[PDB]
Design a binder for this molecule. Structure first.
Ligand SMILES: [Cl-]
Ligand SMILES: [Cl-]
Length: 162
């Protein structure tokens, strides 16, 4: 287990081009290809990115690859964020992962909105934090994910993704 499978599960992996919600070409784990409106452009970018003639279709490794980037980006977002940073730093691999998970789903800003939680997390009150997120729209909106993420903050294991 790792963040890639973690996210493979939470969000999902499409291995072929797709127009996201707002019409944009994406692939793998929400890896956006182009904002432009040309498939050829999406394709080109992919093919560039992947280092071969994908033809719009990729493998999971490739996806990983692509993913490993989005990840790097997210972290940089976190660390640039005066609220998220301290937390990120206090965290252990797994917990960071759980944070990246959230970040990945609601944006650095969103995640940023949970004051207490972050605090508590910062202080190592995994459990309370968890308890605390349980009581949020989030928890109520995508309960299946939230639960896992939540438990993750509490347990600090991948126990929930097995
Ligand atoms: Cl697919
Ligand atoms: Cl809060």
């Amino acid at each position: 287990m790792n963040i890639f499978e973690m996210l493979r599960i939470d969000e999902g992996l499409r291995l072929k081009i797709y127009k996201d919600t707002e019409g944009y070409y994406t692939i793998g784990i929400g890896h956006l290809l182009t904002k432009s409106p040309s498939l050829n452009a999406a394709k080109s970018e992919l093919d560039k990115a992947i280092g071969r003639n994908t033809n719009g279709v990729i493998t999971k490794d490739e996806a990983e690859k692509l993913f490993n980037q989005d990840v790097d980006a997210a972290v940089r977002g976190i660390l640039r964020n005066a609220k998220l940073k301290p937390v990120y730093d206090s965290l252990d691999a797994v917990r960071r992962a759980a944070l990246i998970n959230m970040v990945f789903q609601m944006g650095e800003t969103g995640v940023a909105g949970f004051t207490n939680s972050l605090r508590m997390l910062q202080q190592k009150r995994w459990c309370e934090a968890a308890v605390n997120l349980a009581k949020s729209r989030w928890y109520n909106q995508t309960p299946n994910r939230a639960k896992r993420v939540i438990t993750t903050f509490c347990t600090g294991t991948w126990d929930a993704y097995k």
